[PDB]
A paper describes a structure:
Here we describe the crystal structure of the [name] from [name] SA-01 (TsNirK) at a resolution of 1.63 Å together with its biochemical and spectroscopic characterization. TsNirK is a homotrimer with subunits of 451 residues that contain three copper atoms each. The N-terminal region possesses a type 2 Cu (T2Cu) and a type 1 Cu (T1CuN) while the C-terminus contains an extra type 1 Cu (T1CuC) bound within a cupredoxin motif.
However, a single crystal was obtained that indexed to C121, containing the entire homotrimer in the ASU. The characteristic extra loop (Asn181–Pro191) and the tower loop (Tyr164–Leu176) of two-domain NirKs were observed within domain II. Domains I and III harbour the copper centres [Fig. 2(b)] and a calcium atom from the crystallization solution, coordinated by residues of domain I, is found between the monomers. T1CuN is located at the top of domain I and is coordinated by two His Nδ1 residues (His75 and His125), Cys115 Sδ, and a Gln130 O∊1 residue in apical position. T1CuC is an amicyanin-like T1Cu centre with the His2 Nδ1–Cys Sδ–Met Sγ ligand set and an additional carbonyl O atom from Arg389 trans to the axial Met ligand. Structural data for TsNirK suggest a potential electron-transfer pathway of T1CuC → T1CuN → T2Cu as there is no exposed hydrophobic patch through which a physiological external electron donor can potentially interact directly with the T1CuN centre. The most likely T1CuC → T1CuN electron-transfer route would involve domains I and III within the same subunit [Figs. 2(d) and S3]; in this pathway T1CuC might deliver electrons via a hydrogen-bonded His431 N∊2–wat–Glu385 O∊1–His125 N∊2 chemical path to the T1CuN centre.
Author numbering:
A (entry chain B), C (entry chain A): 20 to 444
B (entry chain C): 20 to 446
The structure:
Amino acid sequence: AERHFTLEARSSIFEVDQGVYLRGFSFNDMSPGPMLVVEEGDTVHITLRNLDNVTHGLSIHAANTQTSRFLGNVQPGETREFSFTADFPGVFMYHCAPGGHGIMAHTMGGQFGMIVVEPKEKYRMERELGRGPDLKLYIIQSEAYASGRDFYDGKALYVMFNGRNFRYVDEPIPVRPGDYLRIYFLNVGPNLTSTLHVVGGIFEYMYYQGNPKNLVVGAQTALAGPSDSWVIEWRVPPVEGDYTLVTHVFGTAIKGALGILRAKKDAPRIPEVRAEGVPGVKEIPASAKRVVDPYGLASPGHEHTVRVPLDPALAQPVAVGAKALEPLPVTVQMVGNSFYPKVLEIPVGTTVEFVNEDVFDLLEGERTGRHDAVVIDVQGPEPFVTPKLGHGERYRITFTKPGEYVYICSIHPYMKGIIRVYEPL
Amino acid sequence: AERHFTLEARSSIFEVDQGVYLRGFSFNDMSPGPMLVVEEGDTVHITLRNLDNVTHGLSIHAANTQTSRFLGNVQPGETREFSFTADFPGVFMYHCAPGGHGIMAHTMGGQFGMIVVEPKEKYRMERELGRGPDLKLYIIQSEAYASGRDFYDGKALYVMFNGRNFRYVDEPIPVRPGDYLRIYFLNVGPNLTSTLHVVGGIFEYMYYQGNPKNLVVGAQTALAGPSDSWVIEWRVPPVEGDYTLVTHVFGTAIKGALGILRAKKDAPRIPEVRAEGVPGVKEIPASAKRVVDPYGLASPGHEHTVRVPLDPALAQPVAVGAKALEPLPVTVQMVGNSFYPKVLEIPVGTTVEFVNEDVFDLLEGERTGRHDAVVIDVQGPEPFVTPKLGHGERYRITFTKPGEYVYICSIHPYMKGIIRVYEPLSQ
Amino acid sequence: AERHFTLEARSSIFEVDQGVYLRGFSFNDMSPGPMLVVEEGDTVHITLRNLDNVTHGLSIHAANTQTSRFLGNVQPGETREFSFTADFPGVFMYHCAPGGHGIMAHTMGGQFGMIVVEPKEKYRMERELGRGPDLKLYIIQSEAYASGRDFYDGKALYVMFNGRNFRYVDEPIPVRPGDYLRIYFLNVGPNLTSTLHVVGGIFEYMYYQGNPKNLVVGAQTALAGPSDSWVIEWRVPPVEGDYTLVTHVFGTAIKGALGILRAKKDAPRIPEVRAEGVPGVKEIPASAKRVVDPYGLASPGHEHTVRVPLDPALAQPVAVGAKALEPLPVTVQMVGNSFYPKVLEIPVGTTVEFVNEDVFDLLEGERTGRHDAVVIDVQGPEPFVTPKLGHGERYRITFTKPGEYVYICSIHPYMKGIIRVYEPL
Ligand SMILES: [Ca+2]
Ligand SMILES: [Ca+2]
Ligand SMILES: [Ca+2]
Ligand SMILES: [Cu+2]
Ligand SMILES: [Cu+2]
Ligand SMILES: [Cu+2]
Ligand SMILES: [Cu+2]
Ligand SMILES: [Cu+2]
Ligand SMILES: [Cu+2]
Ligand SMILES: [Cu+2]
Ligand SMILES: [Cu+2]
Ligand SMILES: [Cu+2]
């Protein structure tokens, strides 16, 4: 058949926990984005629309043909149409791909999902039992970051199944003892490895990449690096109670990646568990505990604020050898399309040094990791507009008077920071 | 056969290097715990006893049947009895499972071990040679943490084979050139991946999860994430000398995960190398150079102490636009069933904000990641008790007078921290 | 056949990005080192020479026989000769092996490379097509570190294919639509996992370790931990354009691990891409923007400098209910054959505590992780010499007068740090 899907690139807000909101980028106002399911040999038609005010694009791992000419560098308001044949069965990632630096920077902000290509060849348990699964479960594991600095460092704030911390503890997935389950698992990462496990289960058959040829049997874990996938076949044992789904990378399980398969003889067949996030929200309620934003300003502001005391060399003349010591500059890094620290408070007389730690400094716009810092809200006498900095390039500003400045990158306008200059009354 | 094993949950202290002690939890006073070996098709009876003052439990990956109802949420002094059939051959992890948050928090404190299910189908090198191994080696790789903060961040202090840094450098494993070795390897993690390697060897046959069907041949490395396992068959080449066992993740090999197979023509046949820690101690000697405790107070105390100077906004009135700036609070995180920083020294007038960074705030007791802070050693006029905080909830306290305080969490009484408040003697 | 290769251990400087220089250790002045290619069943003769002023050695994973007796603990000026038979086909790492602690410490400084053992049994796509590859590509992924602290913590500064950030973006690899490519991939790490991917491709056949028996089919990623390898067979789809080679661990792709296969119908047949770095330099030019050195002093110096104010307990007498508080010591760690922080600036009256965080404290020289700290080129009134510290051992020094001290480890003389003591004028 011919199958058609529409993906819409957008800026969004995701509710990842009770009272916890994440700012980022989506397809169709959900993270993970819409789940696409086709059969091996189908023609797949994609319409990609950019509804945002920055450039986006698309990579789709089910296509064994050129994609970036057709689906990259999609400007604000532009549409693309692309078709391909699904020649390889299994479980595939899709994600945003503006091109260059932006492929990595946008993917980590929420722009990812799953496409399943169901094989003509039946999986082994289906063949052996003469019937299809009693239940199919589709799961994405993914990470959320508090800053571009933390993204470079591999320090995830939350890790989750289908876009919400402990989603399937709050709403346990109903199963029955004796059910043939088929699980479709994709770890999008983007940094951390996963080892998927069910407490009370040994997976009978698993298929690396979801291809029926790549058979592994009798496993306690399914090992998956970023963008690795598996199809897993397992019968629920003939005993009632909770069979917990978890990653055995326990420093990530503790951050949200744990759910429950609740086995009861009379359990209802509910709507299909798709690898899709909850719909995004329109605004942040005033009752929020935390707002996470890797690229821009986050709440509460005080947990992202660095207040620097006066350097000992500025408080008075001090020295080591011959002449007086100069004060040390205070660094603000450009890193992972963000400014680190996000909010800096310094005393009059301090020199700030911007430094670009992003590495890919070719191309332009959302395809580049070059950055500048340009004031957009001026409450002081010393507004600033830095040059555009390549990797490892630097720019110094000395602040001599009190004031407060909100600034952005002109190339990537969702990058935002604050400098405040204080003085004794 | 029917096979019976007894596991005893307890609080323990492990000597992980010369003069270096680690506080945590165990089964039977060793980390890794008792190694269990059965045959495929055996009936396995487990007796679990809780000898500690907090709740514990057990998960056992060789069981393909419901376990949490029968072995979870085991109260202090309680016993459970459970049986299952070993239907699947291989190398399996077992670990503590109070339930919920505690599964992750207790496992990282030391409560893990191995159960092996030997297959009825013989492995390929045994079949080909017509005999069993000349020596079996059972190995667990595991991590130790200085704090729950470091646990969240994946920053291990030590990484080790069978519970002690460079154990098999200090005591090399005797083998002979030409020996048929069979290695049973489990990476328990709980955070880091392993690539097992022997210097001077290429592994002939390997079996993912220890299942004979999952064959990989001719490998320089055996890739294993947390709770992944392998069985490996290899012949020692016909040349004497040291063949070093190591993980090729070299930032973890450097932390303790390296040992020696010492090949000599006249080497005695030693008893099998079991995947079990050295038994623990009851007191820490005065000779100790370091005490590590992820949940509580560590030694020396100064290496875990943050001393804050007076906020510039408190030192005098300061301003940006017009009105004076407020001082920033000093943060104490509850994270990985610990307080971070462990010891905080602040000047009078300072406000502390407790914030709960643990995420799972459901259930109760050892099953929850809710926390409070309650003073239990009062050496000042301002002892305190916070509410019980869920994820991302906060509580502020302003300290106006000098003093010191040791506090715990009432939910998890092994969590411990210190606040000291200082003031110039001139006042 | 009988094949002979010469490896020369030395100290080197690599240009890993434009204007960015990395100090470390090499074979033959390139990182990765020379690529060695043999056939299954060949006798391989190695000549190892140590051209440096510290001990080096060699481990070679293609040898299934004792190596360390013959190639370990190679003193300055020494030569070793070693032969073995290549009995196992695939893609193997080699690296420095002085012994003990130094195996890990030297390998992370750049001393690694690839040896390929081509199988007698033909790979599947070569069998099916009746001909060899149109182009062979040999790729190493490796990491670079700013400090031994960062090495312990898994925090790589750069991650790259064949020794230079975005090398194959700056110079894309020409291919033709329809080409049979065979890729020989080795992740040397030494810490991070990789998931190798081509944008617009699904890998047809892959071989774990490069052994023809270990077949995996139809994959979007090839998962590889440190020292894991693959051989990958893939046909370029019949469409012109760029097919991007990348690791899906996107926090490492963003640090330099991304390249381009540029597909054109009229592309010339270039020479095979060898898994070898760019030859090093003898001096760092005036133009340089960054010098990285995990063991020693880096540039600019101020980005590695910690300046401490006077302890509140030294400023004035303070107490917590009883007698006056003592000041807390300021820690310098010995960790990963380096001092952390690299540069420390402290006020007169401050006590410093050196602590050895390296764990392996047996053996001697480059085989041990024992360390001391000793002032060279003395130009301050209070020079120091610490004892040689084992793991977790400590030593205190109280500084009472102003001055500057450059210091080294006597055991590992390339380790270097600075302490400066300041005083009000
Ligand atoms: Ca919740
Ligand atoms: Ca030791
Ligand atoms: Ca560049
Ligand atoms: Cu995008
Ligand atoms: Cu991709
Ligand atoms: Cu920018
Ligand atoms: Cu427990
Ligand atoms: Cu488990
Ligand atoms: Cu608690
Ligand atoms: Cu070396
Ligand atoms: Cu090696
Ligand atoms: Cu040294």
